[PDB]
Each structure stands twice: as C-alpha cells, then as structure tokens.
Design a protein around this ligand. Structure first.
Ligand code: MG
Ligand code: MG
Ligand code: MG
Ligand code: MG
Ligand code: MG
Ligand code: MG
Ligand code: MG
Ligand code: MG
Ligand code: MG
Ligand code: MG
Ligand code: MG
Ligand code: MG
Ligand code: MG
Ligand code: MG
Ligand code: MG
Ligand code: MG
Ligand code: MG
Ligand code: MG
Ligand code: MG
Ligand code: MG
Ligand code: MG
Ligand code: MG
Ligand code: MG
Ligand code: MG
Ligand code: MG
Ligand code: MG
Ligand code: MG
Ligand code: MG
Ligand code: MG
Ligand code: MG
Ligand code: MG
Ligand code: MG
Ligand code: MG
Ligand code: MG
Ligand code: MG
Ligand code: ZN
Lengths: 181, 83, 69, 118, 23
RNA sequence: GGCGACACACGUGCUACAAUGCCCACUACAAAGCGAUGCCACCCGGCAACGGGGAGCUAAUCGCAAAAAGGUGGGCCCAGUUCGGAUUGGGGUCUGCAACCCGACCCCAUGAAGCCGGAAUCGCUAGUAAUCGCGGAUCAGCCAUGCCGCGGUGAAUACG
RNA sequence: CGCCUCCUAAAAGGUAACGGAGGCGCCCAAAGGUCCCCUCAGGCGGGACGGAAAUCCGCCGGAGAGCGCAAGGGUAGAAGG
C-alpha cells in the first residue's frame, strides 16, 4: 500500500490523542474513516448535451477513479426531465485513494476557495458523518484554466465509524479539517 | 463636508443641554430645531426630539450614528407611493 | 480495480508560491499552486491582511475635542 | 486563481490586465508596477515566475480586494440602512442617494420604465 | 470623453485642475 | 421645512455609442472681456483640490491666461475595449453662522445603459452649417450641460 | 344485447331484476426461456447550483411500493429491479 502521509498521521498523532480524550478501552472503538463519496448532480446533461463525458474525464483526474453515471428514478415536468435519463455522476473512494484525496483537499484544494473562512461546524450528520459542498472545480491541483469549459460543483460525503458528532468532530479537526468558530 | 481645520459644528444651545444633563440627572427628553448640529459621543444615550418642519421626532442615539447630523434621522417628506 | 478506465496514479509533488513542497500521489507528476495550507491567512492563526483595523466604526476617533467641553 | 483569486487576461499589458481585479484601478495598476520593478509594457503571457509571485504578494498585501472589499461595501450599506439614516432610507427604496432629481431621469437606480395610464 | 473627470479633456470641460490637468 | 417629492408622460439640451478614434508627453497660433471686503505673478507643502508666504496692478503697464481643435513622437488593435462615465462606497478641500433634507471641486475604488436609434420630426445657402475652445452678467459659494458674446478650423448643395 | 372483475349471493358450488360499481375487442422480439446478482414505498437528518420534489450520504422502516392496462386474488424465502 502506498505510504500516504495522511494515513501515517492518523495512526501516529490522531489515534493516541483520541483515546486520551474519550477513554476508549478497545482499539476498535476509536472512530475510523470508512469512505468518501463524491457526487456531481449535473442535471444540465439530461437531453440538452452529452456533456457527461467532459465531467467524467475531469472527475477521474481529480480522484484517480472513473466515476459512475446516475440516472433519474422518475419523470418530473417542472425539471423537464424524464425517467431513466443520466443526471449525475458519483465516485466512491476507499482505502489508499480515500486518504490521498483528503490530503489534497485539506492542503491544496480548500485554501484555493474564494473567501475561505472555515468549514461549517453544523453540517455534521448527527450520527458521525460529515458533508460539505463545493461550487468550483478548478481549485483542485490537476485542473487548469485551459481545459475548463463549464463551471461545476460537487458534494463530498465523509463517512466515519464514529457514533456521535462530538467524536466525529474530534477526528476531523485533528486530521486537518478547519472549522468556523 | 466641513473642513477638519475647523471643528465639528454644534449650535452650543443643544450642547449646553446635554452637558448640563450629564451632571444633573442625565436622562430626559429634549426638543431641538438644530438639525444641522452634529451628534457627539456625549450625546449617546439621550432621546432628542428633532423638528422635521412640522413635528418633533424622537431619536434615540447609539454609537454607530455619532458622526452624522440630527436632521438625517428626521425625514421631512412623507411619500408612501403612487396609487 | 478495473483496467483501461482509470488514470494511473504516480508519485508527485505540489509546489506552492511560498516554497512549500507537499509530497503525494497524483495523475500529474509536477503541480504548481498559488496558495497552500501553510501560508493561507485563515490557517496561520490570523495573518491579518490589508484589513486589520477592526473597521474602527465606533467613537474611537474622538474627532478633535478642541471645541468647548 | 492567478492574482487575488482572479485571472487577469493574457495578450494585454500588465498595467491594463491588472485593472481587471475588483478594487484595482489604473492608478493602483501603476503603483503596483512602480513598487515591484516590472515594466508595464510587457504582456502577462511573458513574465518570469519571480515577477508574478512578487506582484501577487505585494498586491494581496497592500490593498483590500475582491470579496473582502465587497463585504466591506455591503456592511457599510447595511449600517446606513439599519440606523435609519436618510441615505439608508433611499438605499431601501433603490432611489438616488446623492440628492439627484427624481421627477425625470434616475433610471440607473429605478430600472426600466413602467408606464401607467395617464 | 468630456464627461470623465480623470482626463485632460474632462478637466478642461469642467474648467478645473488636478493631477490629470496640472498647472 | 417646502419650492429639490416621483408608479409615469412631454419639450429643450449635454455626453456618447469609437481607429477621420481614445490616452500620454513636448511644442505653436486668437479675439472680445473682467479685476480694490478685487485680480493674484512668483516661491514653498500636499498626488491633487488647495493652503502659507508674498510682488505688481486703482490697470494698452500687473493678473485672470491655460487657448483648444492643430503639429511632432509613443501607447492602445476591434473588444462593451486604454470606447463610454452613470450609479455607489471611502478619504479630503473650499465658501458660508450653518453644505442632513439641498453646494461646488480633488483623490482612491466602483465601471451602468449605450454597437448610431419606430412611426416621425428640426436647423442651415458661405466664413453659413459642422466642429474647437475663450470671456461676461447674476453671484459669498454654486447645482451654467442655460443665456448673451468672442475668435480658431472650415464644407456640401440649389437641376427646378 | 358478447367477454372480464367486485357486490347483491343467505361462510361449498350455483343463483334473478331496465339492481349497485368498473373495465375489454389490446399488447411485448422482450414485457419470452434459463443462469447469476440485487430488494421497496415512506419518514427523519446532512449536502454547490437545486426547489415540496432531480442526484449523493446516514439512520429507521415487513411490505403500506412494484408487478403494461379494470377489479379481485396472489406475491420480497419473488411473481418485483
Ligand atoms: Mg457514522
Ligand atoms: Mg479594476
Ligand atoms: Mg423650481
Ligand atoms: Mg431631489
Ligand atoms: Mg421647450
Ligand atoms: Mg432630448
Ligand atoms: Mg453632459
Ligand atoms: Mg473602459
Ligand atoms: Mg474612457
Ligand atoms: Mg445643502
Ligand atoms: Mg447591455
Ligand atoms: Mg463595438
Ligand atoms: Mg414631433
Ligand atoms: Mg436665404
Ligand atoms: Mg442641459
Ligand atoms: Mg344476447
Ligand atoms: Mg365476445
Ligand atoms: Mg349458502
Ligand atoms: Mg368447500
Ligand atoms: Mg358461495
Ligand atoms: Mg331463475
Ligand atoms: Mg323465474
Ligand atoms: Mg336494459
Ligand atoms: Mg343484475
Ligand atoms: Mg371493475
Ligand atoms: Mg370500457
Ligand atoms: Mg374482450
Ligand atoms: Mg413482441
Ligand atoms: Mg409479462
Ligand atoms: Mg417475466
Ligand atoms: Mg400493494
Ligand atoms: Mg386504465
Ligand atoms: Mg393486484
Ligand atoms: Mg408485495
Ligand atoms: Mg426480504
Ligand atoms: Zn504556501
């Protein structure tokens, strides 16, 4: 397995501090990191364009994994969308690729956001998970201004083994998630 | 605006009112016509009834309205709308 | 891991304007950025930018006082 | 995000390209060139990376720009609107603030004409 | 044009002086 | 305090929509006027408005006063742009007892509509039209892009 | 005016009225055979554009979903994807 610094840091500085703060008696009680799911609800590629290919190529470069197409479950007139048409993309990152992506996000992606003042501390799921929303894709290091044709955002789902928000919050700040006061 | 080589202008008849209040029971209701008088930090806390040309409007002074003039807080025209 | 559909990841470096070098794996073996986590103002404590005076909007000027008290 | 999170256009001179940043005008686009030792006659596409990084650092350290400036302006307008200032009242209704006539003209504030029955 | 205060032409139109139209 | 309002409608104008142009530096060439609680040379300080000293002139003597379009050189290269300068935020100067309603000007930032205008309608026959600047009355100051004057450059066409 | 479903119909079947309610006169080349895999509707909380409602994540939820078209029967230990 690739020696990622973020995974190294979790096992060296984060795990011993977590057991200090919360007093887990089992080495498997301490919250772990399960997976990261990145979803792109395009919605503009229903029938007006097959521009899913442009976003699939960009998403594969950022995460190293080719994403999968998600189709509409039903037809809605107000969105002018039919059942079964492709209206999104999704990629799931686990193990080494999960650690690699978060290291880039915390270090070279989030600092490039316009007027960054920290992450939302009230976005915790309530059972130990976190979700954040991005408006721009050019903040990632592998994306340059030249091949950017349209602006696109994404939702990032961070899933942990923590049971409560307070234990999931502690893991994330030590890992490097910066939060607003 | 006024030049900083000159001091900020107060009519000296309302300044006497707030100053005399500040050492003699400093809270009452003053009626004034000096809309051109500039609010002073000492005036904070007072309720001043400022003429709009027809009536005295009560204005309660706070910190973030210190450098303005009293007349800016008593509108002189009633509009609502057309129709 | 399916074959032929995933960009192969290679060891890579990301160089920031402040000289910071972050070591990771990416699809591009050399990346340059303009801001990183070690120089962004929100991360280095406060790093007060061109705005640092707290807006000084209160009576904190004293506006002379050369007039009569 | 090249300078202050914005992309100044290529094929234009540096002084002309700098003015494309919210909060940077021609006067500041000359000041930022007379304090970083860079020729205004050159194009942005032809710049040494040292020049670009030094110019970016100096510009982002000297002047409040872009979203921070917008926040400052909006906060000032909110301060005027909240305290019941006359300028605040005219900011609520979208009417001219600097004492212009409103019987005619005043179209930049009021928008398109809304003809009624006379 | 003549409506711009930050030019020689505009200052001439307004009949004033300054940085852009020195005396 | 109002005559300065503001869902709208009309008249008269000003500024533009650009390369027969815009910006920057240097460099020419007028006329008619005004000036003693006035006109202010020159020097100093501030990017500047302007402020502090301070001559000369009751003025064919001294000042306003710089004329501008022009000429030379450079920059911009067809874009809502180095076109256009409305609106708004901030910092200031001056007049005035006092610039909030409701003054003018300087500097920084903001950089709206506008790509030559529907039915229609106006002026002008020669130093005229067009275009460029300058002075005066009222006036502490000025909302003058108005009015009354002055000169610079200088057309087209009239068959009938 | 023939055919299908429910009630009337009196707990086997059958049972009338110009009694009470609804459908059919098709369709599918896969909506057929088999093998393999999978499991809903809904509610609550979180998430760029994005909402009552698009796509994504977590939790509860045993069939209240779905099964081309009426109704009834049946059905997730599948007949549903
Ligand atoms: Mg969890
Ligand atoms: Mg700019
Ligand atoms: Mg009138
Ligand atoms: Mg008005
Ligand atoms: Mg008329
Ligand atoms: Mg007109
Ligand atoms: Mg005009
Ligand atoms: Mg422009
Ligand atoms: Mg211009
Ligand atoms: Mg006034
Ligand atoms: Mg437009
Ligand atoms: Mg054009
Ligand atoms: Mg007409
Ligand atoms: Mg004639
Ligand atoms: Mg006019
Ligand atoms: Mg029969
Ligand atoms: Mg039949
Ligand atoms: Mg029976
Ligand atoms: Mg039986
Ligand atoms: Mg029976
Ligand atoms: Mg019978
Ligand atoms: Mg019978
Ligand atoms: Mg019958
Ligand atoms: Mg019957
Ligand atoms: Mg039926
Ligand atoms: Mg039928
Ligand atoms: Mg049939
Ligand atoms: Mg068939
Ligand atoms: Mg079938
Ligand atoms: Mg079947
Ligand atoms: Mg059912
Ligand atoms: Mg039917
Ligand atoms: Mg059924
Ligand atoms: Mg069922
Ligand atoms: Mg089951
Ligand atoms: Zn850095």
């Amino acid at each position: 397995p690739l020696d990622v610094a973020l995974k190294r840091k979790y096992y060296e500085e984060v795990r011993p501090e977590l057991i200090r703060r919360f007093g887990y008696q089992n080495v498997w009680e301490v919250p772990r990191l399960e997976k990261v799911v990145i979803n792109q609800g395009l919605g503009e590629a229903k029938e007006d364009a097959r521009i899913l290919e442009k976003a699939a190529q960009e998403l594969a470069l950022i995460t190293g994994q080719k994403p999968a197409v998600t189709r509409a479950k039903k037809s809605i007139s107000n969105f002018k969308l039919r059942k079964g048409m492709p209206i999104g993309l999704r990629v799931t990152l686990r193990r080494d690729r999960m650690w690699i992506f978060l290291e880039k996000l915390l270090n070279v992606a989030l600092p490039r956001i316009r007027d960054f003042r920290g992450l939302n501390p009230n976005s915790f799921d309530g059972r130990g998970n976190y979700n954040l929303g991005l408006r721009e894709q050019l903040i990632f290091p592998e994306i340059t201004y030249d091949m950017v044709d349209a602006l696109r955002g994404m939702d990032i789902a961070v899933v942990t083994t923590a049971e409560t928000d307070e234990e999931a919050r502690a893991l994330l700040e030590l890992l490097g998630f910066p939060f607003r006061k | 605006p006024r030049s900083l080589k000159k001091g900020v202008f107060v009519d000296d008849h309302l300044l006497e009112k707030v100053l005399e209040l500040n050492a003699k029971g400093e809270k009452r209701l003053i009626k004034t016509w000096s809309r051109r008088s500039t609010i002073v930090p000492e005036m904070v806390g007072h309720t001043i009834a400022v003429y709009n040309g027809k009536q005295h409007v009560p204005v309660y002074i706070t910190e973030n309205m210190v450098g303005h003039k009293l007349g800016e807080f008593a509108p002189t025209r009633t509009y609502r709308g057309h129709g | 891991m399916k074959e032929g559909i995933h960009p192969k990841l290679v060891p890579a470096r990301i160089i920031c304007g402040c000289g910071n070098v972050i070591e990771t794996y990416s699809t591009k073996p050399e990346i340059y950025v303009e801001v990183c986590s070690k120089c962004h103002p929100f991360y280095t404590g406060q790093q007060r930018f061109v705005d640092t005076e707290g807006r000084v909007e209160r009576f904190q000027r004293r506006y002379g006082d050369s007039y009569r008290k | 995000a090249r300078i202050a999170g914005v992309e100044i256009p290529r094929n234009k001179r540096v002084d002309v390209a700098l003015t494309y940043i919210y909060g940077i005008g021609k006067a500041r686009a000359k000041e930022a060139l007379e304090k970083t030792g860079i020729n205004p006659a050159t194009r942005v596409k032809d710049l040494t990376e040292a020049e670009v990084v030094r110019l970016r650092e100096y510009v982002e350290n000297t002047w409040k720009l872009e979203g921070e400036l917008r926040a400052e302006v909006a906060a000032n307008i909110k301060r005027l609107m909240d305290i019941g200032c006359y300028r605040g009242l005219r900011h609520r209704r979208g009417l001219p603030v600097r004492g212009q006539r409103t019987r005619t003209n005043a179209r930049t504030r009021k928008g398109p004409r809304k003809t009624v029955a006379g | 044009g003549k409506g711009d205060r930050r030019t020689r032409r505009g200052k001439i139109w307004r009949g004033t002086y300054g940085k852009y139209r020195p005396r």
